[PDB]
Amino acid sequence: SGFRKMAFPSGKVEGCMVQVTCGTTTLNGLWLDDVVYCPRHVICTSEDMLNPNYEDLLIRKSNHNFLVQAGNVQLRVIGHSMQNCVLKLKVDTANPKTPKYKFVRIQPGQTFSVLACYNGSPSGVYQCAMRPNFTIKGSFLNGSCGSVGFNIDYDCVSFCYMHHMELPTGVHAGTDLEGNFYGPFVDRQTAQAAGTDTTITVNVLAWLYAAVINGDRWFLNRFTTTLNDFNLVAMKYNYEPLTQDHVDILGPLSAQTGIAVLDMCASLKELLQNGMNGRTILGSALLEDEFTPFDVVRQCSG
Amino acid sequence: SGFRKMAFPSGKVEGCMVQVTCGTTTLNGLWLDDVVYCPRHVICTSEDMLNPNYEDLLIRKSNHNFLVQAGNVQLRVIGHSMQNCVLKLKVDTANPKTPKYKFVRIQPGQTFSVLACYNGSPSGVYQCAMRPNFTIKGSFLNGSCGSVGFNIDYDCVSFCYMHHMELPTGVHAGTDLEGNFYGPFVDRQTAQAAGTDTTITVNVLAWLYAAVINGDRWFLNRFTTTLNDFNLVAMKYNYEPLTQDHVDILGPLSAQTGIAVLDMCASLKELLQNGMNGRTILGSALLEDEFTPFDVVRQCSG
Ligand SMILES: *[C@@H](O)c1csc(N(C)c2ccccc2)n1
Ligand SMILES: *[C@@H](O)c1csc(N(C)c2ccccc2)n1
DSSP, X not given: OOOOOOBOOOHHHHTTXXXXXETTEEEEEEEXXXXXXXXXXXGOOTGGGGSOOHHHHHXXXXXXXXXXXXXXSEEOEEEEEEETTEEEEEESSOOTTOOEEEEOOOOTTOEEEEEEEETTEEEEEEEEEOOTTSOBOOOOOTTOTTOEEEEEETTEEEEEEEEEEEOTTSOEEEEOTTSOBSSSOXXXXXXXXXXXXXXXXXXXXXXXXXXXXXXXXXXXXSOOOOHHHHHHHHHHTTXXXXXXXXXXXXXXXXXXXXOOHHHHHHHHHHHHHHOOTTOOBTTBSSOOOOOOHHHHHHXXXX | OOOOOOBOOOHHHHTTEEEEEETTEEEEEEEETTEEEEEGGGGOOTGGGGSOOHHHHXXXXXXXXXXXXXXXXXXXXXXXXXXXXXXXXXXXXXXXXXXXXXXXOOOTTOEEEEEEEETTEEEEEEEEEOOTTSOBOXXXXXXXXXXXXXXXXXXXXXXXEEEEEEOTTSOEEEEOTTSOBSSSOOSXXXXXXXXXXXXXXXXXXXXXXXXXXXXXXXXXXXXXOOHHHHHHHXXXXXXXXXXXXXXXXXXXXXXXXXXOHHHHHHHHHHHHHHOOTTOOBTTBSSOOOOOOHHHHHHHHHO
16 A cells, blocks of 8 residues: 555666767767667757757767767767757667667656656656646756656656756756657747646546545545536636546546546545645645556556 | 655666565565575465564575575575564575665655565655654555665665565555664564654755745745744644754755745744645645755755
8 A cells, every 4th residue: 555656667767878978068868779869959059049950050060079978988979860859879889788668759648757867877766747738847957958758568668758958937848759849849049938737637536546545535425427517617627628538547446446437526526626625635735647547556556 | 947756766776676485475585795685574474473483483494495586587595594574595696786785774754765566576666754653655565575765875775674564554664674673563463553653844844945946935934933932833733843953954955045944944833823825835735744955955956
């Protein structure tokens, strides 16, 4: 029992992290087979950011402009190319610690672990979610560019996020590993800001199911509701619509607790209308939406 | 910017985890140099737990009673001994992945990362604190016995916790790596229960400082207070006393934000008297006490 913001073990990823320097810019890269992947921002200066032409900035560079450091060992760059917002630096050595891996793109509402890194050295590991507005609420300082997000299934690392920047509200934006931003954000200097955000309803439901599995039940009730009447109330509280698919995905949790999905919705509605009246759920005084149904099963079941 | 429950990267620890079987009991062990460390509970059955004599149970065992599995490779046990509540199984092979390490014992109020493990395979990594009542609020299922807690400084793993069991309230109890329980808990079947718990005041203060560093400031006020008048109120709210030492340890955070420690106490007092009035601090509606002053500096400063 117990319910924590639990990341994947980070080892397979730590063995791929490297330091990439170009000019006076240092940041992190990801070293898989004989390629290192990193934000293209590495070829810019401060004054370049106001409107860079990256195709331009790159053609004026050479392999020798890029220093790659893996631990101590210098890696020799033998090729460079841009892929959307990432660079790919071909190097003369394949990473011996390359795991089985895939580059996936996730959806808003899905979670992943982040290995924050500085100068090629991993500093910490946490879990977060892609928000509906394609930001994440990360924890990142200067130098963290190129830190990666991931999920692990069996021995296979699904890399899903590369870190690029912090927006004015203090939230974070980045790309998939093919260099395509999550959300309408650009790697240039702009008044760009996170769009309006919502609560991930299906996740809140999944977390209510975690809480019941962990013996908190005070918020349960004998009421039920229609999907439609539920969504009427969720809309009112800036919660995302719940769909039949989400109802179906909650099925195993509903069967394991014998609470019907729509009964759990009835509970949520009342929590939205009445608040908590000073109690908590899994150590929280707020409704938590950063755990997927998969997260709950994996942690409350194995 | 951003503020997360951030664990240490778990890699150095994942390379030490192994599976230990004796009889029909399987659990985890920690493989450092040519020793594997594991809970002594591994030599018991269900019916042994009612009052085991472990000195007895152990003398009736042999090296061949203990199967150690590291990944695939079988490890050969060439020696066994008990040390308080842990066993030490000498094996014929030193772990090539042994990091620099130390066995430390922590205090109530200090944090550490946990690598939950099942059958020798790491499943996830999270951060928690030793509570004032020497429990932790972990997230552990059947099979998790022997999972370890740790802190990492430079390349040196300070192992501080080995997991042994879950108490009736759903919280967790275990030992240091020399086999000495944290708190008044025993590895036998007893009506044993967590004692009364308190809030770690110094940590709450440290987290208020994190929040200011991250631009939440609504809870600040122009008041101050005495240490004595503060502790009068903290006592009333089941918060631990704050000491001069804690005031001194908060000094760098106070200097970095220019809020005096005692001014921050004045803020906390008002939050304890008035509640939050529906706002939040670093995404929380509660006062959070699982980050030390060290945690905040390391994460808001590097
Ligand atoms: C590190 O990968 C990276 C890419 S974009 C960026 N910064 C600091 C930036 C500069 C100016 C405007 C937006 C973003 N960091
Ligand atoms: C796994 O290390 C371990 C040691 S104590 C324990 N259990 C399940 C237990 C059984 C009976 C009374 C208290 C604790 N697990």
